[PDB]
Amino acid sequence: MRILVTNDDGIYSPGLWALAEAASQFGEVFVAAPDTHAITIAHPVRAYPHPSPLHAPHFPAYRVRGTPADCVALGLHLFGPVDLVLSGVNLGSNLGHEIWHSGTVAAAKQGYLFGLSAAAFSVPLNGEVPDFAGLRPWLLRTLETLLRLERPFLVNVNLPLRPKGFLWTRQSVRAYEGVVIPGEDPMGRPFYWFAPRPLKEAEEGTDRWAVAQGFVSATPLRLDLTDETRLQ
Amino acid sequence: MRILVTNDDGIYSPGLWALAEAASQFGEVFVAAPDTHAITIAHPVRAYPHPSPLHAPHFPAYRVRGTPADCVALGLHLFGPVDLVLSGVNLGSNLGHEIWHSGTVAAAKQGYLFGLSAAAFSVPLNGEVPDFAGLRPWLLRTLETLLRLERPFLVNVNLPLRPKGFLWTRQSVRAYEGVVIPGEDPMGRPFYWFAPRPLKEAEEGTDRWAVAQGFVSATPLRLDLTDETRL
Amino acid sequence: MRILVTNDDGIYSPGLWALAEAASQFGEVFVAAPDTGHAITIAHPVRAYPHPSPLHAPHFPAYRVRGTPADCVALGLHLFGPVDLVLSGVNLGSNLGHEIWHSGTVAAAKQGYLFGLSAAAFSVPLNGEVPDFAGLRPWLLRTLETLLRLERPFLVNVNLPLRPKGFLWTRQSVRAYEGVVIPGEDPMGRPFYWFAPRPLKEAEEGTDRWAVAQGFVSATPLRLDLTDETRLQPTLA
Amino acid sequence: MRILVTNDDGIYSPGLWALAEAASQFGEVFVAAPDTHAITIAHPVRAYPHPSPLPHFPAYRVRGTPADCVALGLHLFGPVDLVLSGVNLGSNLGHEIWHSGTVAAAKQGYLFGLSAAAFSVPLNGEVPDFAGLRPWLLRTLETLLRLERPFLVNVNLPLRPKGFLWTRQSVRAYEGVVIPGEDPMGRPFYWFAPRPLKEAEEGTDRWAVAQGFVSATPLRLDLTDETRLQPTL
Ligand SMILES: [Mg+2]
Ligand SMILES: [Mg+2]
Ligand SMILES: [Mg+2]
Ligand SMILES: [Mg+2]
């Protein structure tokens, strides 16, 4: 199995290599991440061979001057053929409403659009930074569970800092209330603070709920945004 | 009813005012458009009162230097309570896979997340300049259709340059074939062109097929991205 | 001596931690790196969060700043005050000749100088490659010892070639350019223009660009005044 | 004389067209303004014909930096003799000059071997009235064109000028000023408000505008500090 690993934090993010190293336990890993969300069709993108980090296995890698999705398109070209696309591990959550505009998820989705299996890995940190050393057992367990699915799949994974269980979840979909608070730059002029907040607690079985409980969340994603119940 | 109109092309787009003018036939309109996709929580957002053009109906408006989503949040605050959120008319399409990365759609979606009914409007350019005088009738008809839906609703609308009909559609979801075209700049340095293409043509009943046939496309959207099928 | 280290490549750049470690051989080092303009953000408030230094680097108190490199200096002098030196880099990419004008790496250093402190910017020309900070360390230390001998305050722009073979105080390469615009079209027929301006001559001896090309570490003392002092009382026709 | 006019506020800035109209009194004017920062080489640049606001000037809207506009303009309207940038809405005095897009365009023009000048008007409170400034803009341009060439000058015009002065760049020291605070979400942030240590020196651009005079500062391309050059050991 040939695996392509990317992310949206950059070729220097420790989560990227944590995912690459973890993924190497299942197949040949190839890395291609941005050097710093759709495929760039506008202008040409640059890409340079990059050396895998000193304290980590050897990984054929490329630094891409483009979007995470660009890395997938370019990766399938430079490392083709690829069977799996893994994106992350993102430094920050990608839960509920956040999924829609996630760059990490976009890369995986792009992999799916190309007929491959893919998964996005994120870690809600809401304060500190993740410790990928004590998180590896869980990454491996998660990957092992995902690789048992029928191909092709598209899964969104969120691993709480100190995971204590795995669980399949559905996306949290809560309503929000608009909260705006007026202020002024100490130079006179006015501005506004935006602090939208959910109206209720995450429902049971949702990705939000699951991580709050301290479990790893794995949500199968759909590509069709159509609301069928409304079609006629 | 009170209606908030926004977009992502900016406060100076003829598309924004065409939507605002059309929406004004159905209720009072307030405008909040970006100065030039999530709500800004990191830092505060600036907004300035924006004047109405001499040769046009006056709309209370604000130029918000933030995201389209920010415009919705702030608009709900400066003009609240708002009953409906309209976004567009965008100068460019928002069909199929494009819906994901759309600022136009995001604003409408943000309105929906706040418990309101919303819709996004876009028009494929295809080398021509949209004629909003000719599109007005179709905007009015589309709104008439939308305003009778059970609320709340969230719809993505795409109007062809010269419409000949209206059609409820589902999002075009096609697989792609990667295509990488290598090249090099005048300085010898190599680079890559991306030109991925759909493995097949748009299916009948999809937004892409619809506008291709010359029909206004209206796709009802869902917020839930989970594939309940694989649980 | 207390030293503030920043850069413009962000908190995860290996060039940043290489400069922090090298700098630590001369005093207490504190890090404040941008997260992701060049001026200090005054319009609105800036976010800054404590950041744990990387696992494979000595410990350093650090902050990830949601602002510009200059902001990191402004924030740094406040969180770690008092600071004696502001070091910026080691940037992944050169900052030679005309490049100095638009450099974020240089801007943070300049910001330190604007506050009355001594400062230096460090960069490494890449040419589609990455530096070996283990091999450059000797040269980084060498350069730092030198800079610290200078009468303070100072502002120096440093460029280290991948594999240094010496050190040289240099002046800024200032060359005239010829406009070169090559029309083109993308894989959709849409037209665009390639800009490929080229210098009218080769970098002259004694310039930063020439020295690095020769494999020498380049150190250029910079001025803050952009005034052309020879034309303040111009003869008009 | 063929003149390229650009700026960094964009193709819709009233300052740009006020500068274009003023320059037209001295030669043929062509415009290339950014579509709202050195020359873009990493990839190509898109540019499109754009109509001048309702005098007519050939114009292009460039999706690039102000420097790209100068490089593109030399190609589109070559041969060019003079590059003028502005009139920027906001000052470009003292330390600001270093990171100014407006000045960058002019510098780019000078690097291509042409004469160039940047123009800006300090704001906040009152909006510039270019009809009132036209006399001073023409006076200034007229003066610059009597200079030996090539030249590179940064110009700052006060809302209502009463004189003209050649000036040197204000170079002052700053003292850091940070004010910790909190958002409505509890999270902390910091305000930055660094203030200059002393008052603007007599004869500096900043002093001149404060006196109500047009400020014209000749600029140098070489940032090297010769008083600190050293021999090899
Ligand atoms: Mg990220
Ligand atoms: Mg748009
Ligand atoms: Mg950099
Ligand atoms: Mg400006």
Please report the number of interchain residue pairs, chain C to chain D, with beta-carbon separation below 8 angstroms: 184
Breaks (C-N over 2.5 A) in chain A follow: 36
Q: Kindly state whether B55 is in contact with chain C, defined as any CB-CB distance less than 8 angstroms.
A: no
Concatenated DSSP letters for D26-60? TSEEEEEEE-------SS-B-EEE-PPP-----EE
Chain D CB contacts of A44 below 8 Å: 43-44
Nearest by CB to B42, from C47, C188, C194: name it: C47
State the best of B35, B43, B48, B65 to mutate against chain C, taking most chain C CBs within 10 Å: B43
Please report the number of interchain residue pairs, chain B to chain C, with beta-carbon separation below 8 angstroms: 22
**Which residues are near ligand 4, the ion (C-beta closer than 5 Å)?**
D 8-9, 88
Q: Which amino acid is at A100?
A: W
Breaks (C-N over 2.5 A) in chain D follow: 36, 54
Choose among B204, B125, B194, B215: nearest CA to B172: B204
The binding site of C for a divalent metal cation comprises 8-9, 91
Chain D CB contacts of B187 below 8 Å: 41
Rounded to whole angstroms, the Cα distance separating B15 from B201 reads 29
Rounded to whole angstroms, the Cα distance separating C123 from D135 reads 47
Rounded to whole angstroms, the Cα distance separating B151 from B140 reads 19
Rounded to whole angstroms, the Cα distance separating C59 from C28 reads 11
Choose among D2, D24, D19: nearest CA to D77: D2
Q: Kindly state whether A46 is in contact with chain D, defined as any CB-CB distance less than 8 angstroms.
A: yes
Distances (CA, A) of D26 to A146, B152, D73, D142: 72, 62, 18, 8
Q: What is the DSSP letter of C24?
A: T
Distances (CA, A) of C229 to B222, C225, D150: 66, 9, 16
Rounded to whole angstroms, the Cα distance separating B22 from B140 reads 6
State the best of C36, C68, C126, C186 to mutate against chain B, taking most chain B CBs within 10 Å: C186
Choose among D93, D87, D182: nearest CA to D136: D87
Rounded to whole angstroms, the Cα distance separating C55 from D80 reads 56
User: How open is the CA angle C84-C85-C87, to the nearest 5 degrees?
Assistant: 160
Rounded to whole angstroms, the Cα distance separating C6 from C186 reads 39
| Selected residues 171-200 of chain C with any CB under 8 Å from a CB in chain A | 186, 188, 192
Chain C CB contacts of A51 below 8 Å: 130
Chain D CB contacts of B12 below 8 Å: 12
Run of H or E residues at D195? strand D195-196
Q: What is the DSSP letter of C15?
A: H
Q: Which amino acid is at A192?
A: Y
> Cβ separation of B194 and A73 shorter than 8 Å?
yes
A9 known member of a binding site: yes
Tokens of D116: 């160039």
Distances (CA, A) of B3 to B24, B105, B213, B223: 8, 16, 31, 22
Q: Which amino acid is at B175?
A: A
Residues in a beta bridge with D166: D216
Choose among D29, D152, D143: nearest CA to D80: D29
Superfamily of domain D1-233: Survival protein SurE-like phosphatase/nucleotidase (3.40.1210.10)
Topology at the third CATH level for domain B1-231: Stationary-phase Survival Protein Sure Homolog; Chain: A, (3.40.1210)
Chain B CB contacts of A180 below 8 Å: 73-74, 76-77
Residue D122, classed as helix, strand or coil, is: coil
Tokens of D145: 């064109």
User: How open is the CA angle D31-D36-D42, to the nearest 5 degrees?
Assistant: 85
Residue A94, classed as helix, strand or coil, is: coil
Residues A192, A181: contact at Cβ < 8 Å?
yes
Which chain D residue lies closest to A182 (C-alpha atoms)? D184
Question: For residue C148, how far is its CA from the centre of ligand 1 (angstroms)?
Answer: 39
Concatenated DSSP letters for A166-211? EEE-B-----EE--EEEEE-TTS-EEEEE--EESSPPPTTBHHHHH
Q: Kindly state whether A162 is in contact with chain B, defined as any CB-CB distance less than 8 angstroms.
A: no
Concatenated DSSP letters for C55-115? TTS----EEEESS-HHHHHHHHHHHS-S-SEEEEEEEEB---GGGGGG-HHHHHHHHHHHT
CA D81 vs. chain centroid, Å, equals 18
Tokens of D44: 């190509």
The reply to whether CATH 3.40.50.300 applies to domain C1-237 is no
D9 known member of a binding site: yes
The domains of chain C are located at 1-237
Tokens of A120: 């996005």
Choose among B71, B66, B83: nearest CA to B23: B83
Which residues contact residue A202 at a Cβ distance below 8 angstroms, ignoring those fewer than 6 apart?
Answer: A96, A172, A174, A208, A209, A212
Rounded to whole angstroms, the Cα distance separating B66 from C174 reads 40
Chain D CB contacts of A181 below 8 Å: 184
Please report the number of interchain residue pairs, chain B to chain D, with beta-carbon separation below 8 angstroms: 7
| b/e map C55-94, b = 16+ CB within 10 Å | eeeeebebbbbbbbbbbbbbbbbbbbeebbbbbbbbbbbb
Which chain D residue lies closest to A185 (C-alpha atoms)? D191
* Domain A1-232 class in CATH: alpha beta
Chain D CB contacts of C171 below 8 Å: 222, 224, 226, 229
Residues C13, C104: contact at Cβ < 8 Å?
no
Give the closest-approach CA distance of A38 to chain C in angstroms: 17
Question: For residue B176, how far is its CA from the centre of ligand 4 (angstroms)?
Answer: 42
- The residue behind tokens 């020439």 is C210
Choose among D99, D112, D119, D91: nearest CA to D5: D119
**Count of CA atoms in the C-beta half-sphere (13 A) of D133:** 27
- Phi (first) and psi of residue D195, to 5 degrees: -120, 140
Q: What is the DSSP letter of D4?
A: E
- The residue behind tokens 């509920």 is A96
Breaks (C-N over 2.5 A) in chain C follow: 36
User: Considering every ligand atom, which ligand is closest to the CA of A103?
Assistant: 1
Run of H or E residues at C51? none
> Cβ separation of D41 and B187 shorter than 8 Å?
yes
> Cβ separation of A221 and B224 shorter than 8 Å?
no
Rounded to whole angstroms, the Cα distance separating D233 from D225 reads 19
